[PDB]
Homo-oligomer: A and B are copies of this chain.
Amino acid sequence: SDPKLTKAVDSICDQFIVTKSKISQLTEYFIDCMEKGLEPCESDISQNKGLPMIPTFVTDKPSGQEHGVTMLAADLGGTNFRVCSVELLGNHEFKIEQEKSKIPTFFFQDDHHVTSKDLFQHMALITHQFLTKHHKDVIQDYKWKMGFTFSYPVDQTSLSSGKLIRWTKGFKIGDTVGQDVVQLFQQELNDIGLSNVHVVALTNDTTGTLLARCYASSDAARAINEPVIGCIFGTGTNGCYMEKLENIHKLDPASREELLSQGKTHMCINTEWGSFDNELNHLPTTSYDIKIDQQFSTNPGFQLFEKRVSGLYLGEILRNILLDLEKQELFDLKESVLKNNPFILTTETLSHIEIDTVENDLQDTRDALLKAADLETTFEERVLIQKLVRAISRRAAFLAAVPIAAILIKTNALNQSYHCQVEVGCDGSVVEHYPGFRSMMRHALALSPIGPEGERDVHLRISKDGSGVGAALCALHANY
């Protein structure tokens, strides 16, 4: 009912298209950025704008026969904090008791001065509540070993040590930057009486995801599909991979030779690939992606691949596309609350729009927009909101495949034996629950330099085991 608005939207959609040549370019550039990040660093790690390529100091892939007494685990992400108790039984089996809690809104507000003590004190309190609900008989007696999954870039110096490099995903607490997060958590655990709980391991949620699958993958399943990558596609995006110790040059030459002699071959690398091409040398960029990077983000100039892929930022891309279409007098925001409310449109809102149908007059879309920002719409308007949402998602999925394809190429994981395939472990609300995301990722892996022959050898498997099992495995190994 408005040919101008119709053709204005069709033009915004075409900006988000990713071509096969762009996939190939970014795949080859990503590999080049991997090689740069694996070399010794030139300056402060918090200033590096390139692929961080952080060594995690995890050199042994679980077998599945590891066993021990109930370990503790703690996982701080970008939205929720969870604590669980995992009993590794061996033979690719385990028992888990877990409690999940949303990160209080107080920590995502600048009205008040938030500090590391405020956060880790709350984490230590949730830890106490979990030990009282599931192990009330021995809360203050056992010498619990805990693994801490920290879903944020860390300058890891050992399995138990590492300072935060920068906050990401809506978290801004300047106090923590540069602090061994294990100590911070331990200090608050000691102040509430849980000094008998020792945090023995620090892992990224990518590293943890890979370890968990290497353990639970049945001997039969693992023989065919070997887990090679631990991936995340939720509030943020990131992934890890095993790199040959000889190529990790940033590691001290003595440390490499000291590790190599011990019978080790590889070490996990937390790519932090949300910070891939932070200079925007090749990443697709629109006027709306710069608005998010510069005005509405907590970390301007960093995690730019993330700002085009992860679920924290996709819904915001739509808000800027719509506000820009009202500034042009093409779209009527009516009495909406979009203006001056960043991130009011979430990715969960867009999930109810990706697969809504016209035969229902796009009713789910209508209700989802009213619930999120009191925005009324007509059918013709919802038809075009869907065309935009579907374009924002496809670009996110197609870009989400570049780091996976690049890693597989560099490590030659696809040049295996007859009938052999690989497994990429993916956890996150986007890959898991967003309609069509995983399907579109594979379309890109087929368009990537590995071709459709490669996509069929890659098994994008959801890892609903959790990064706690991975950290639990890192705790069973380390000493109290």
Is A436 in the interface zone, CB < 8 Å from B? yes
A456 to B460, CA, bound (A): 12
Inter-chain contact A355/B446, CB cutoff 8 Å: no
Inter-chain contact A453/B457, CB cutoff 8 Å: no
Q: Residue of B at shortest CB range from A436? A: B419
A355 to B224, CA, bound (A): 10
Inter-chain contact A439/B456, CB cutoff 8 Å: yes
Please, which residues of chain B bring their CB within 8 A of the CB of A456? 439, 442-443, 446, 452, 455
Inter-chain contact A452/B457, CB cutoff 8 Å: no
Q: How many residues of A contact B (CB 8 A)?
A: 20
A452 to B443, CA, bound (A): 9
Q: Residue of B at shortest CB range from A437? A: B419
A453 to B447, CA, bound (A): 11
Interface membership of chain A positions 395-422, coded 1 if the CB is closer than 8 angstroms to chain B and 0 otherwise: 0000000000000000000000111010
Inter-chain contact B455/A435, CB cutoff 8 Å: no
Please, which residues of chain B bring their CB within 8 A of the CB of A355? 417-419
Contact of A435 among B419, B439, B452 (CB under 8 A): B419
Inter-chain contact A354/B439, CB cutoff 8 Å: no
Inter-chain contact A446/B439, CB cutoff 8 Å: no
Please, which residues of chain B bring their CB within 8 A of the CB of A419? 354-355, 435-436, 439
Task: Kindly identify, within residues 345 to 401 of chain A, every residue whose CB is under 8 Å from any CB belonging to chain B.
Answer: 354-355, 357, 390
A452 to B442, CA, bound (A): 11
Inter-chain contact B453/A443, CB cutoff 8 Å: yes
Inter-chain contact B439/A421, CB cutoff 8 Å: yes
**Distance in Å from the Cβ of A451 to the closest Cβ of chain B?**
9
**Distance in Å from the Cβ of A143 to the closest Cβ of chain B?**
40
Q: Residue of B at shortest CB range from A421? A: B439
**Distance in Å from the Cβ of A103 to the closest Cβ of chain B?**
25
Q: Residue of B at shortest CB range from A434? A: B419
Task: Kindly identify, within residues 186 to 231 of chain A, every residue whose CB is under 8 Å from any CB belonging to chain B.
Answer: 224
Please, which residues of chain B bring their CB within 8 A of the CB of A417? 355, 357
Please, which residues of chain B bring their CB within 8 A of the CB of A446? 452, 456
Please, which residues of chain B bring their CB within 8 A of the CB of A457? 439
Interface membership of chain A positions 419-459, coded 1 if the CB is closer than 8 angstroms to chain B and 0 otherwise: 10100000000000001100100110010000011011100
Q: Residue of B at shortest CB range from A455? A: B456
Contact of A418 among B224, B390, B442, B455 (CB under 8 A): B390
Residues of chain A having any CB pair with chain B under 8 Å:
224, 354-355, 357, 390, 417-419, 421, 435-436, 439, 442-443, 446, 452-453, 455-457
Q: A354-B419, A419-B435, A446-B456 are in contact. List 9 more A-B contacts (CB 8 A).
A: A224-B435, A355-B417, A355-B418, A390-B418, A419-B436, A439-B456, A443-B453, A452-B452, A452-B456
A-B CB contact pairs (8 Å), 24 listed: A224-B435, A354-B418, A354-B419, A355-B417, A355-B418, A355-B419, A357-B417, A390-B418, A418-B436, A419-B435, A419-B436, A419-B439, A421-B439, A439-B456, A439-B457, A442-B456, A443-B453, A443-B456, A446-B452, A446-B456, A452-B452, A452-B455, A452-B456, A455-B456
